[PDB]
């Protein structure tokens, strides 16, 4: 697994692969690891797959639940706190094996300068969190590789499509070194998923522009 989030002028992008390893034996090649939580929040989750789809799904309901109740979405501050609680209330499990570690990406519609309204918040197994303020972050089996490649390719981030390419290139760079990450599968037509968030909202990036982007990176390296 490798999830990665990027901050560009307009807002933020987040994309993660779809491999699923059990031992050193592939057991999935199509897993959705990144989900849209609400209009301006997307969340990717690494570790145990069972807790993964559950966090995303449950969180999303809690956010919308607050909105329907109080009539207004939570502060970005709130959104961060709720997710943080959720993670702590799972330490018991995580201790034994069921470890699920989120990565939050969002757009603060209330941020002072709505060109820095892109947010990336990484999370701690114990329930901690730091607002990244460094443009890129990654969590997972090969995040270490992504973060280190993405370090070089960050200058290249200019805008939406610009940033997205660096994301997809890190995920490729990761999978190239972490056997548990899994890069773009041409033979089968399986490509990492992605979500972008700007002032307009958060939307799934169609595999089309990703698959295209993927081949760009493959050929250029070739």
């Amino acid at each position: 697994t490798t999830i990665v989030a990027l901050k560009y002028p307009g807002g933020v992008v987040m994309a993660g692969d779809r491999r699923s390893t059990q031992g050193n034996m592939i057991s999935g090649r199509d897993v959705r690891k990144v989900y849209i939580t609400d209009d301006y929040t997307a969340t990717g989750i690494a570790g145990t797959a069972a807790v993964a789809v559950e966090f995303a799904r449950l969180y999303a309901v809690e956010l919308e639940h607050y909105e329907k109740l109080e009539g207004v979405p939570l502060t970005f501050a709130g959104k961060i706190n709720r997710l943080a609680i959720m993670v702590r209330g799972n330490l018991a499990a995580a201790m034994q094996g069921l470890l699920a570690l989120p990565l939050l990406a969002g757009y603060d519609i209330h941020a002072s300068d709505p060109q820095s309204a892109g947010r990336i918040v990484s999370f701690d197994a114990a329930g901690g969190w730091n607002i990244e303020e460094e443009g890129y972050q990654a969590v997972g089996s090969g995040s270490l590789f992504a973060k280190s490649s993405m370090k070089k390719l960050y200058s290249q981030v200019t805008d939406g499509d610009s940033g997205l390419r660096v994301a997809v290139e890190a995920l490729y760079d990761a999978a190239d070194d972490d056997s548990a990450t899994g890069g773009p599968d041409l033979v089968r037509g399986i490509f990492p998923t992605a979500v972008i968030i700007d002032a307009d909202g958060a939307v799934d990036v169609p595999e089309s522009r990703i698959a295209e982007l993927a081949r760009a990176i493959i050929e250029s390296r070739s």
């Binding site: 799904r57 309901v61 919308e64 639940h65 329907k68 109740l69 009539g71």
Partner: protein, 220 residues
């Protein structure tokens, strides 16, 4: 006098309902329209419940706002338990009916409210939008066309018995509604309006703001 006792309860509630403001919802081309007179800016009498189901009530605020939450409470849970697509509003009607039913028996004073749950078919699918009326005593009935509650209904209801355009346009139905509402009484852009837009992808709720409201509003 267990029999006579129940009559007193009915009375007390039925009265409160009357002395409270008027609320109306109806079926139109794109879904269901929610309109009720409300001078307040923050205290809302109409609300979303789940993806394709709306809540509107009239009466003692603190009482129906409670129920409004309870609904959202129940809905969200139900959708996490099974799936989104498995919440019906017909369900929430049963629940409200159950709840108010219990209240009317157990609680000292029965709730002074009348409620309306409304569902409008999922995005792709096409189906006849459904309306439910839940009364203070727990009785439940479903109108196929339009529902009126709070204050004196007879004139507001009667106005609609005729002015109801089966397949109205948004602007047309709003026109019909506001005018039909004035029938029991004014009617300024100082009230609460929202709709269940069947056309919407997922969340089929949208509140009609102040500025955009004017574009559709009826002259008197």
């Amino acid at each position: 006098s267990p029999e006579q006792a129940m009559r007193e309860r009915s009375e007390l509630a039925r009265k409160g309902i009357a002395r409270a403001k008027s609320v109306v919802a109806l079926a139109y081309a794109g879904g269901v329209l929610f309109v009720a007179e409300n001078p307040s800016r923050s205290l809302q009498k109409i609300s979303e419940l789940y993806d394709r189901v709306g809540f509107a009530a009239a009466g003692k605020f603190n009482e129906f706002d409670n129920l409004r939450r309870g609904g959202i409470q129940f809905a969200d849970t139900r959708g996490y338990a099974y799936d989104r697509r498995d919440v019906t509003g017909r369900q929430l009607a049963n629940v409200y009916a159950q709840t108010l039913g219990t209240i009317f028996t157990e609680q000292a004073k029965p709730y002074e409210v009348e409620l309306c749950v409304a569902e409008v078919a999922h995005y792709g699918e096409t189906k006849r939008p459904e309306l439910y009326r839940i009364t203070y005593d727990g009785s439940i009935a479903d109108e196929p066309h339009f529902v009126v509650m709070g204050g004196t209904t007879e004139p507001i209801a009667n106005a609609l018995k005729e002015s109801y355009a089966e397949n109205a346009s948004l602007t047309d139905a709003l026109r019909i509604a506001v005018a039909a509402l004035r029938a029991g009484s004014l009617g300024v852009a100082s009230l609460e309006v929202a709709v269940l837009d069947a056309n919407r992808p997922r969340r089929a709720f949208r509140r009609i703001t102040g500025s955009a409201l004017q574009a559709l509003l009826v002259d008197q």
